[PDB]
Design a protein around this ligand. Structure first.
Ligand SMILES: C/C=C\C/C=C\C/C=C/C/C=C/CCCC(=O)O[C@H](COC(=O)CCCCCCCCCCCCC)COP(=O)(O)O[C@H]1[C@H](O)[C@@H](O)[C@H](OP(=O)(O)O)[C@@H](O)[C@H]1O
Ligand SMILES: C[C@H](CCC(=O)NCC(=O)O)[C@H]1CC[C@H]2[C@@H]3[C@H](O)C[C@@H]4C[C@H](O)CC[C@]4(C)[C@H]3CC[C@]12C
Ligand SMILES: CC(C)CCC[C@@H](C)[C@H]1CC[C@H]2[C@@H]3CC=C4C[C@@H](O)CC[C@]4(C)[C@H]3CC[C@]12C
Ligand SMILES: CN(C)CCc1c[nH]c2ccc(O)cc12
Lengths: 286, 53, 232, 332, 222
């Protein structure tokens, strides 16, 4: 009975993620009025999330539902590589969106003169290159005899050096870069907001409302990403160095992995569907 | 004065013979029916003879 | 409008010579360019084509490979590189400008050309008579035939008529079998079936004497007939 | 003292002529029915908002004007761009195609309708003559012949221009408000103009005097088109309605409006048979109106922004429409 | 197959023209389009540099193209919409004009007409989200005039000091009060006719702030 419920919930999650990513992509595809640099990055992120939902999730669903791997070592390696690649691509896509927003906010001259879709294409290419660099090592090396020792378990590589390198370049460096960029954006927004008597009081009310609004969307941006990925990468960094001691409860690890996967579901949620232009396009087309 | 110009312009009040609206409508409908087949937008032309197909 | 060719001369067999044509008084970039040769005491033959922007380049089978055509839009000049000249290559090349859009008149202007003295499903265009004696003031008819229907599926018959007066370059008369070329007397008229065509003059004049040529633009392997020489 | 009595006499005389409305005559006419209009050719390339479109005499070449300082002549069948002219004044709001297809005119917020010669030995669209002399923006410039063109300007004056001389042959100043649209009769001996004073006036080209005036509209008239027979013309205004006026009756025969249509009309055109009224609205859609029964025979949405221009071919086979979305779609 | 040689050449020409049009549009995209209205317009234009007058000036690595729509006495309800997408609107009003009546048997006051125009443009439906770069011109003449003739004649309900600072502040507040959508758009006000190119500096700063705020309104940070 438990297996049926888990399968139903996971199938619903995968179906909703696939529909969300596909509709987000179609939003820009069918209507070119949304063909903006930031919207281009959002569409690239949506495509990455669609790849996550279609390719790796069903394999993971088969892995989790049956509590075993029944596809072979080659399939396990392919699944691990694709999952790592697509998740790193999504993380770096959101990081590049943040970087582009920071550049636009702090560099209006570049925004008007030197910002074009070529910039978005270059950012997408760099993000995919980073994802490939993260995901290739397991296929071109590593994969120690201990790794994948259990025939029925599709365990990920736990090599100390590879684990630290991948975790860093996939979550921590992006996390620090996003933190710095959004802090600079916060300072810029505060400066802009701060920069008869009843009118002054009304302006103060508007400024306070804008300050609350900017505090909210940042809190949202950082908290969603943290709650979705940070536990997973913390576990992935601790367990390799905590093999002797940490018990690794099954439920906690599975829940953390599912939160990491649902990061892909929430990325379009946070970026595309929420957007005023995207929601307007959805209303018009529908 | 603008009055002189206005009266000169309004002098056109009765310099043209007029026709009742019924006859004008009859002429309009006669023209429409006469060229009914000459208007592809009114009568869908076959796809073979349609340059835009 | 004016086209001046350069690079003509005597070249021994196997040599390489470049023919340059200077475009003045018209937008060279807008117009495509053609090269049509004329061997002495012989008819016309298409050589090569280059479109605006160099996107499309075509060559005749007998010249393909050896001869290459390049355009220089900034300088408004045309070049036709020639390599490994053969005895058959001894002919005067005439540069022609054409613009392609509905209502246009391709091959509406012809240059003086440059004299050069060296040493397959293609539609064949044939003219009824090589020469015809005529007198001024009387109607004159010239007829030609094509081995394939020139009436394209779009409904346009790509038939071209040209007149080359003695000591002069060809002048376009009819470009799609029904339309008179700009700056031409209304006397000339064009008519014909899907494969048989006739060029008729309502009343001959002293300036009409010359060699008339026919051409099809249905396919790029253009073929020029032997011509019809009118003598007063 | 100020011609008080004259105004009432014309009103009474025009009222006396009303015998039967156009609706009564058209009751026995069978309905046209829904028209399955579908987009066939899509035109793109000028990014800014398109403001003017006009068909050529050949029914295959059409000219479009956009706010990006570009007017484009299109090959209707193959959608091939045949000419793209860089305009010195980018505020172009009107364009026209010469009957012979040799010349093109365009005007905007400037006070000039430059004449462009398509057929040149140099083979480029160069400014032939600039028809300067207006004090306001040019609303519409329509050709009469290869040498005569009629211009409409926001300064309330319409001027007949001799291209060769470059001076106004005849100046029409009867309109109190700004004239927004220009329509030429089939014979070209007379033309009608619409103005912001919610009225239209009949102008005789050869003599230069107003022959009739029409005042059925409630707001500014934006577009006008002559009925193919030449004895009537249609008007489009900000009322969200368009009206049919007959030159031989001086009275509005019928109005084309709907309850759910509230925004103004930007364009108007007739089919070759005259049975259909092609009207462009600000709700991004074009409504086809049965000229006889005054019913919507079809709807062309086609666009994501206001329909700014449209026209029917001389052969009456296809209708083109432009919109502020920067696209022109040809329907059949 | 279905196209002939002429058809292929025409298609090539069409796509070349499309490329040229796209290049021209891209070039025009990086141009800051400004609407100018007004009242010292000539002096402002001189310090910044019969139909629409277009002026181009480059300042601090940015391109500005200013559209002076003066001399268009025709109704602007039929051509005001042509200026959609303008980054900002420059509005010029002369402070010294508080004592003028625009002739016409003194049917109106020039300052009142200027503020009526300002209100009409600010509340226009086509500029609901367009910033206004307001210039208060002729400050020296305004001071020289208020030194003798109080501005209370222009503002009967204004009871306060006649010094330049107070009068200028009151006029600026009155102009800003015309904004019925103050939340959506701002009004950058500056005093001119005593300043060198730094008026261009003020225009550039206002445009930069408008661009930054528009970018933020995209992300949701402002
Ligand atoms: C402290 C005391 C204790 C309490 C504290 C703890 C709990 C507090 C909870 C706080 C609430 C969190 C969610 C906020 C909800 C909310 O207020 O949204 C309201 C309506 O919008 C919808 O709901 C959107 C509804 C539809 C969304 C799509 C989902 C359905 C389809 C899913 C995919 C499948 C397709 C079929 C109001 O809308 P909003 O103000 O939230 O919208 C803003 C959004 O929040 C910003 O993110 C966004 O910035 P962006 O990142 O750049 O995009 C802004 O542009 C803006 O869109
Ligand atoms: C690689 C693909 C999965 C493709 C995919 O990404 N699908 C997404 C989706 O289905 O949504 C899977 C689907 C079926 C799988 C096969 C079978 O289901 C099971 C079979 C198990 C044997 O041990 C050998 C491998 C073998 C023969 C599997 C190889 C991997 C296959 C071929
Ligand atoms: C942000 C949103 C999309 C989060 C969605 C909630 C996700 C994380 C939920 C939905 C259903 C949940 C699963 C339901 C049942 C089981 C079986 C259990 O033996 C291991 C955990 C596991 C597999 C759960 C882990 C977390 C889970 C996948
Ligand atoms: C297992 N999936 C959720 C992939 C998550 C992921 C992306 N990049 C990584 C780098 C190292 C690592 O251990 C895991 C990852």
């Amino acid at each position: 009975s438990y297996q049926v419920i888990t399968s139903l919930l996971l199938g619903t999650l995968i179906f909703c993620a696939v529909l969300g990513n596909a509709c987000v992509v179609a939003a820009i595809a069918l209507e070119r009025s949304l063909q903006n640099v930031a919207n281009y990055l959002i569409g690239s992120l949506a495509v990455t999330d669609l790849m996550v939902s279609v390719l790796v999730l069903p394999m993971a669903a088969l892995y989790q539902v049956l509590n075993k791997w029944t596809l072979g070592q080659v399939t396990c390696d392919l699944f691990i590589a694709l999952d790592v690649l697509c998740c790193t691509s999504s993380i770096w896509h959101l990081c590049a969106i943040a970087l582009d927003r920071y550049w636009a906010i702090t560099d209006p001259i570049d925004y008007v003169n030197k910002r074009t879709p070529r910039r978005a294409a270059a950012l997408i290419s760099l993000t995919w290159l980073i994802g490939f660099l993260i995901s290739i090592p397991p296929m071109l090396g590593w994969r120690t005899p201990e790794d994948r020792s259990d025939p029925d378990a599709c365990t990920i590589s736990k090599d100390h050096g590879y684990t630290i390198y991948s975790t860093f370049g996939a979550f921590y460096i992006p996390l620090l870069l996003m933190l710095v960029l959004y802090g600079r954006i916060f300072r810029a927004a505060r400066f802009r907001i701060r920069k008869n008597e009843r009118n002054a009081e009304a302006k103060r009310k508007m400024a306070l409302a804008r300050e609350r609004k900017t505090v909210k969307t940042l809190g949202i941006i950082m908290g969603t990403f943290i709650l979705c990925w940070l536990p997973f990468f913390i576990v992935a960094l601790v367990l390799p160095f905590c093999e002797s001691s940490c018990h690794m409860p099954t439920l906690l690890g599975a829940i953390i992995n599912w939160l990491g996967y649902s990061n892909s579901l929430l990325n379009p949620v946070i970026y595309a569907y929420f957007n005023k232009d995207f929601q307007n396009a959805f209303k018009k087309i529908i | 004065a603008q009055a002189r110009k206005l009266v000169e312009q309004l002098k056109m009040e009765a310099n043209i013979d007029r026709i009742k609206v019924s006859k004008a409508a009859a002429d309009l409908m006669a023209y429409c029916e006469a060229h009914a087949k000459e208007d592809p937008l009114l009568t869908p032309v076959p796809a073979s003879e349609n340059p835009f197909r | 409008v004016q086209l001046v060719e350069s690079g003509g001369g005597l070249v021994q067999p196997g040599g390489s010579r470049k023919l340059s044509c200077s475009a003045s008084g018209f937008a060279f970039s807008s117009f495509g360019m053609h090269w049509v040769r004329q061997a002495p005491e012989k008819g016309l033959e298409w050589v090569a084509y280059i479109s605006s922007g160099s996107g499309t380049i075509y060559y005749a089978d007998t010249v393909k490979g050896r001869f290459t055509i390049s355009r220089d839009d900034p300088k408004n000049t045309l070049f036709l590189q020639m390599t490994s000249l053969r005895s058959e290559d001894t002919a005067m090349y005439y540069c022609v400008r054409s613009i392609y859009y509905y209502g246009s008149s391709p091959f509406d202007f012809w240059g003086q050309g440059t004299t050069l003295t060296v040493s397959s499903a293609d539609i064949v265009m044939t003219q009824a008579t090589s020469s015809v004696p005529v007198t001024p003031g009387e109607s004159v008819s010239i007829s030609c035939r094509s081995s394939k229907s020139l009436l394209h599926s779009n409904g346009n018959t790509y038939l071209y008529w040209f007149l080359q007066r003695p000591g002069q370059s060809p002048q376009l008369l009819i470009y799609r079998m029904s339309n008179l070329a700009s700056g031409v007397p209304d006397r000339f008229s064009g008519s014909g079936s899907g494969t048989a065509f006739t060029l008729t003059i309502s009343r001959l004049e002293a300036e009409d004497v010359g060699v008339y040529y026919c051409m099809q633009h249905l396919e790029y392997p253009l073929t020029f007939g032997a011509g019809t020489k009118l003598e007063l | 003292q100020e011609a008080e009595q004259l105004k009432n006499q014309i009103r009474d005389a025009r009222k006396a002529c009303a015998d039967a409305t156009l609706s009564q005559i058209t009751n026995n006419i069978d309905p046209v029915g829904r028209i399955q209009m579908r987009t066939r050719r899509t035109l793109r390339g000028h990014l800014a908002k398109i403001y003017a479109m006009h068909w050529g005499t050949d029914s295959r070449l059409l000219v479009s004007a956009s706010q990006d300082g570009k007017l484009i002549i299109w090959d209707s069948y193959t959608t091939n761009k045949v000419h793209a002219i860089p305009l010195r004044s980018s505020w172009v709001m009107t364009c026209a195609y010469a009957p012979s297809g040799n010349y093109v005119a365009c005007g905007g917020l400037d006070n000039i309708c430059s004449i462009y010669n398509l057929k040149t030995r140099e083979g480029n669209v160069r400014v032939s003559r600039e028809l300067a002399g207006h004090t306001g923006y040019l609303s519409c410039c329509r050709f009469l012949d290869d040498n005569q063109i009629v211009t409409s300007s926001g300064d309330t004056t319409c001027a007949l221009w001799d291209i060769e001389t470059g001076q106004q042959t005849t100046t029409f100043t009867g309109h109190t408000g700004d004239v927004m649209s220009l329509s030429l009769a089939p014979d070209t001996r007379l033309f009608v103009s619409g103005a912001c004073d919610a009225s239209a006036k009949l102008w005789d080209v050869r003599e230069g005097m107003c022959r009739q005036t029409f005042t059925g509209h409630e707001s500014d008239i934006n577009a006008i088109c002559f009925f193919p027979n030449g004895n009537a013309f249609a008007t489009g205004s900000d009322d969200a309605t368009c009206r049919l006026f007959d030159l031989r009756a001086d009275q509005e025969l019928m109005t084309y409006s709907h309850d759910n249509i509230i925004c103004g009309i930007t364009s108007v055109s007739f089919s070759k048979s005259g049975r259909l009224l092609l009207a462009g609205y600000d709700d991004f859609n074009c409504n086809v109106w049965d000229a006889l029964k005054a019913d919507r025979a079809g709807v062309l949405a086609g666009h994501d922004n206001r329909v700014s221009c449209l026209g029917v071919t001389d052969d009456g086979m296809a209708v083109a429409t432009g919109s502020w979305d920067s696209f022109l779609k040809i329907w059949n | 197959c279905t196209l002939s040689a002429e058809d292929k050449a025409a298609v090539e020409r069409s796509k070349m023209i499309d490329r040229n049009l796209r290049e021209d549009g891209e070039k025009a995209a990086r141009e800051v389009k400004l609407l100018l209205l007004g009242s010292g317009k000539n002096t402002i234009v001189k310090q910044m540099k019969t139909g629409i007058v277009e002026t181009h000036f480059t300042f601090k690595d940015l391109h500005f193209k200013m559209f002076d729509v003066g001399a268009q006495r025709s109704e602007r309800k039929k051509w005001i919409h042509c200026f959609e997408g303008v980054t900002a609107i420059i509005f010029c009003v002369a402070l010294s004009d508080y004592d003028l009546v625009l002739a016409d048997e003194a049917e109106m006051n020039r300052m009142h007409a200027s503020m009526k125009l300002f209100d009409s443009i600010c509340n226009n439906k086509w500029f609901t989200d367009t910033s206004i770069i307001l210039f208060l011109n002729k400050k020296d003449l305004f001071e020289e005039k208020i030194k003798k003739s109080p501005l209370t004649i222009c503002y009967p309900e204004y009871a306060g000091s006649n010094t330049y600072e107070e009068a200028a502040a009151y006029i600026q507040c009155q102009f800003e009060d015309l904004n019925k959508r103050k939340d959506t758009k701002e009004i950058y006000t500056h005093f001119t006719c005593s300043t060198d190119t730094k008026n261009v500096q003020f225009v550039f700063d206002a445009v930069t702030d408008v661009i930054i705020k528009n970018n933020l309104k995209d992300c949701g940070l402002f």
